[PDB]
């Protein structure tokens, strides 16, 4: 068994009218931890952004701690996967194939 | 990353010499009659090469390579291996990958074909 991380855009810039999080999460906040469990990762919204409070998010990022390093990169959504090296890798294969539509718009 | 984005994996695979001394994983992977190695990245779409310790099968260069410190040759200190490697999307890049890993594991096992 392995470990497999990847992060992937969540492309704020590019887009920075559409509800990203709101997309992900669903209107009853269940979409995302779904979605994990349909591909066998673990999927997590961090960097940037991905805290409630801006504050309190710019004074954790400025304490140094390693467990904040995150909130010095753009938001992003981590894959995480813990399995034999194939399984591993195909799973991450899926989740990738099964976030595409969570990140871009749908609308204009 | 950029989901769209091509991007670069890599992954060792390791060749499991010092529990089968005598069974010629290389031979096996590399011989014209099986073309074995080329068939797996047409078939997977991946890119493969025997890396480390006796991949070179001429074991005084093989040092020398090592001993001469240039970068392409550091492989040398890491036990024998396949290095599986693919270039495309995220997602194919994985699925690409376990794919490989899968249909490797039949020439990893020595029996007497």
């Given amino acids: 068994n392995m470990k497999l991380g990847q992060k992937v855009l969540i492309p704020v810039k590019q887009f920075p009218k559409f509800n990203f999080v709101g997309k992900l999460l669903g209107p009853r906040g269940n979409s995302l931890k779904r979605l994990q469990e ?61 976030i595409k539509k969570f990140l871009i718009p749908d609308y204009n």
């Fill in 38 to 98: 349909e591909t066998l990762t673990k999927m997590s919204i961090l960097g940037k952004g991905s805290m409630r409070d801006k504050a309190k998010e710019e004074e954790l990022r400025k304490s140094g701690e390693a467990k904040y390093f995150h909130l010095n990169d753009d938001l992003h959504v981590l894959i995480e996967v813990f399995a034999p090296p194939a399984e591993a890798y195909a799973r991450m294969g899926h989740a990738l194939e099964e």
